[PDB]
Amino acid sequence: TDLSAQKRLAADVLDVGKNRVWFNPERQGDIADAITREDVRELVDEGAIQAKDKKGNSRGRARERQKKRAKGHQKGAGSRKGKAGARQNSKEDWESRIRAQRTKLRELRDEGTLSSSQYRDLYDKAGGGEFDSVADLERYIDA
Amino acid sequence: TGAGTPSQGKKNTTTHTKCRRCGEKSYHTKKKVCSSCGFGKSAKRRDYEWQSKAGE
Amino acid sequence: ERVVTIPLRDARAEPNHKRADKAMILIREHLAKHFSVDEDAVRLDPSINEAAWARGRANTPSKIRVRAARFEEEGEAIVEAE
Amino acid sequence: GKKSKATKKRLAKLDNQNSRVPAWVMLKTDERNHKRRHWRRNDTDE
Amino acid sequence: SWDVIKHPHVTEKAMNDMDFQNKLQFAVDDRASKGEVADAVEEQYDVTVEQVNTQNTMDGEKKAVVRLSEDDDAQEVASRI
RNA sequence: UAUGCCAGCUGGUGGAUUGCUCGGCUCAGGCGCUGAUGAAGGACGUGCCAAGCUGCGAUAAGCCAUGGGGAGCC
RNA sequence: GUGGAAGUCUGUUAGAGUUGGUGUCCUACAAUACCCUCUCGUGAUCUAUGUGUAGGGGUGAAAGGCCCAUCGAGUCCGGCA
RNA sequence: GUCGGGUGAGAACCCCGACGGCCUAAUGGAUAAGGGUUCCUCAGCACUGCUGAUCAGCUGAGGGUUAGCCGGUCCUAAGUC
RNA sequence: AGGGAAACGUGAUUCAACCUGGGGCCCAUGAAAAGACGAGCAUAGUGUCCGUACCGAGAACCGACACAGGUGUCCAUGGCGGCGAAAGCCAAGGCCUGUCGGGAGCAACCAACGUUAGGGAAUUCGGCAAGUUAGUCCCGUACCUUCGGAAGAAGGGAUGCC
RNA sequence: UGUCCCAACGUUGGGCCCGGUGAACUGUACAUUCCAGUGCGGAGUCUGGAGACACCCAGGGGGAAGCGAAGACCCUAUGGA
Ligand SMILES: [Cl-]
Ligand SMILES: [Cl-]
Ligand SMILES: [Mg+2]
Ligand SMILES: [Mg+2]
Ligand SMILES: [Mg+2]
Ligand SMILES: [Mg+2]
Ligand SMILES: [Mg+2]
Ligand SMILES: [Mg+2]
Ligand SMILES: [Mg+2]
Ligand SMILES: [Mg+2]
Ligand SMILES: [Mg+2]
Ligand SMILES: [Mg+2]
Ligand SMILES: [Mg+2]
Ligand SMILES: [Mg+2]
Ligand SMILES: [Mg+2]
Ligand SMILES: [Mg+2]
Ligand SMILES: [Mg+2]
Ligand SMILES: [Mg+2]
Ligand SMILES: [Mg+2]
Ligand SMILES: [Mg+2]
Ligand SMILES: [Mg+2]
Ligand SMILES: [Mg+2]
Ligand code: NA
Ligand code: NA
Ligand code: NA
Ligand code: NA
Ligand code: NA
Ligand code: NA
Ligand code: NA
Ligand code: NA
Ligand code: NA
Ligand code: NA
Ligand code: NA
Ligand code: NA
DSSP: OOOHHHHHHHHHHTTSOGGGEEEOGGGHHHHHTOOSHHHHHHHHHTTSEEEOOOOOOOOHHHHHHHHHHHTTOSOSGGGOOSOHHHHSOHHHHHHHHHHHHHHHHHHHHHTTSSOHHHHHHHHHHHHTTOOSSHHHHHHHHTO | OOSSGGGGGGOOOOOEEEOTTTOSEEEETTTTEETTTOTTTOSSOOOOGGGSOTTO | OEEEEEEOGGGGGSOGGGHHHHHHHHHHHHHHHHTTOOGGGEEEOHHHHHHHTTTOSSOOOSEEEEEEEEETTTTEEEEEOO | OOOOHHHHHHHHHHHHHTSOOOHHHHHHHTOOOTTOOOTTTOOOOO | OOOSEEEEOOSHHHHHHHHHHOEEEEEEOTTOOHHHHHHHHHHHHTOOEEEEEEEEOTTSSEEEEEEEOTTSOHHHHHHTO
16 A cells, blocks of 8 residues: 555645644555545544644743843853843943933923923933933932 | 856756747747758858868 | 563674664564574564664663563564563 | 747647557557657757 | 637546536637637537636647536536537 | 686577678769749648658648549558 | 944855865766865855857956867868868 | 554565654745656556665656736837847 | 634734835946826726746756756744854754665774873974864953054953852 | 874774675786896896695785876977967
8 A cells, every 4th residue: 555645635635744644554445545635534534544733842941041031140251152232232222221311301391390491401411421321310410 | 166067057048949940949049040041140041062062 | 471681782783873773683683592483573562662762773771671472383472562 | 937839839749749659550560669758868949 | 711619628627627617628729719719619509608718738739618607507518429 | 626728519699691682872865943823941730549751731641623544442 | 422434354144265185086976076174255245137249359357367078269060081 | 764564476665653863044835947747647667766666757548737917918128130 | 704623812022024214425326118196986898819737956957867066036033042044952844765785893904083191393395184272251451553453462360050 | 282202992984794786997818926147238928947736715005117198308390389
């Protein structure tokens, strides 16, 4: 018996890779007689032809690691491979910081805490890179 | 790069094809001229005395 | 029938990436000799095969306990893991 | 490649010329196809 | 002058089309258009052609898959020849 | 007396030889243009079964007429 | 601080190239191959397809290099015995 | 690759299962050129296959490619006639 | 509608495709034409002709071969990893056809290659071959210089897990 | 730092034996040679001696001025480019 053709049909009827199709070893004679796609579906309904399960990589160990690192661990000098600028893009970081600082100033102005002149003065200084962070800005604001 | 075998790989270009006028695979589809019968170049049929020995 | 311990130290003589194959041959030759039967007549149950290939083709165990039976009209042995 | 209607006709003919001398012709002639052409070993025209 | 229809194309596949889709298959002259095939077929078998699909075959001939109307029955039209 | 040398015998391999000639080579006499009324050439078709060659051209190894020929032919 | 220039750097990203091993091969896997090493890799960059230039003529960041395994004058047939 | 098993006159290499492996810009998926029937089915082993073969891109015979809305077709490019 | 054995989800982040903006460069200025829009709606009829199989490559292409060579495009967003389209490992998918096997602890010799005490270039035309170093962070960095560079100069320290 | 002193052990693929497949190079003849001599002055074959029972396996290549190529060097030709 030669069931290679049936393997190709079964793969397509089951809509699976040929390598995952299973043919009951005790029914080679019957599968051998399977000539049509309908003959195949029939054997499929009899469980004579089945599809093995596809595996997926476990992300369990990945998640544990992800947790340690989210908590700040496993990132010492001995764990880094890329250059500092590679681990954190400095331009992207500046956009983050300067936007946070501008939004802050923006809220204090509408809120009334800052006159459009103080705001202006602080805004210009922020864009000039005078503040390391929002906190740093807030601190400077309180004289 | 070797001018021999390695340079033979890029040869998938069609040039000479079956000619409408004489039937020979000599109609150069790029030039639209048959190198065998002259179709595309001459109304008269391509032919030369050097195609045979001088006294024949 | 009886339980026998087959030594596979001689599979080390074969190149390492191919022990499993050689081991499987040693097992057949051992049963053939100790049960006075032709190597053609020794049938190894897949269990034995899987045991020898458990750690891949290069890491075969040094021994393997095998249960084998002898009988029939042409003489033979049927063997399995234990 | 993209074949035209005429090219298709020619290849069809070449496939047809690629058949064997019918058995009955052997008996009728009291006893080879010299134009046998394999797709791999041989090359067609055009 | 050449005729449109050459002969019925009868093969396993042509049977399935006839039995399951009410279509008839013919070998026609490769110079014939779908329209010419539709007409020729109606006038020869007294039927109503609903659709014609063509193909220039690797045999050097043209094949036409002619579907008839629900009013006509391919199985019967083909049985008389 | 292995491996083996020389000559022969039986069988083979090979295709020489001799015989044979449906092909060539050369000489001689006769004759001599075809095509837009689409030639020559080529392509693709055409047979009950048809791959090659020949013939033929969707009327496709052929259709018609007259003469010859003759009981066979495809 | 921002910005992100460059015939700029590192880089077997892709891709291009071809220094050493004078290794393997050398009736080859191959009439120019295999492996390791090595150079370039935003530019005068690499590449597909189409297209142009023809033989004392082309083309040449020039080596007499290249113009279909053919080049200090291609190939084919003829002159030609 | 191995152990069982299937078919067969014949099985190390044709097929099934298990176990063990190989490939991750490819040894996967879709295609251009180019090939031209190599595609599918059935029947086979004189030929081809770096061994064998019940297998096959091999041998023989049949079958298979369906479009208003995918391409061509149309436009114009370098340029060609 | 369909599909699924079944459930036949809701939110989020980073976001290829796709859309839409701002800036910079040129002794370089980055096609054309057909066509579409401009220019409504109903109903009906028509929409012919050619291509379509398959391979697309360590056996379907070129290389005389089932040739370790050559041969364009798209998939560049599968998981872990890490700077990464890198390595290594693993999915999906593919394969066991880079297609001859069986046997000998399997000697000499050869191809690739591992490890070699003490010495450490004595080898050699020559350190050829091989080896050493190496990722990242901190410290620190000479001569010279066209002030750009030299520079990762050199040298020193750190590096895991919980 | 196995480049060297100075080599060793090991790993994988061969090599060796077995089944199957199955070429090529090369061949005036003879041929078990060795030491000397001789000879157109570079001899398995001539001369004198010596040695020499036949066949077969594996080896590293001393000889056959080994195989491969009508010498590129040099000269000559009332040669070529
Ligand atoms: Cl298309
Ligand atoms: Cl903006
Ligand atoms: Mg910056
Ligand atoms: Mg050349
Ligand atoms: Mg056929
Ligand atoms: Mg169509
Ligand atoms: Mg650069
Ligand atoms: Mg680089
Ligand atoms: Mg070009
Ligand atoms: Mg010079
Ligand atoms: Mg097939
Ligand atoms: Mg079969
Ligand atoms: Mg298709
Ligand atoms: Mg192969
Ligand atoms: Mg040492
Ligand atoms: Mg020295
Ligand atoms: Mg010295
Ligand atoms: Mg070196
Ligand atoms: Mg003597
Ligand atoms: Mg000479
Ligand atoms: Mg000279
Ligand atoms: Mg001269
Ligand atoms: Na071909
Ligand atoms: Na027909
Ligand atoms: Na005449
Ligand atoms: Na015929
Ligand atoms: Na600045
Ligand atoms: Na190289
Ligand atoms: Na010339
Ligand atoms: Na000549
Ligand atoms: Na095989
Ligand atoms: Na990733
Ligand atoms: Na060593
Ligand atoms: Na020698």
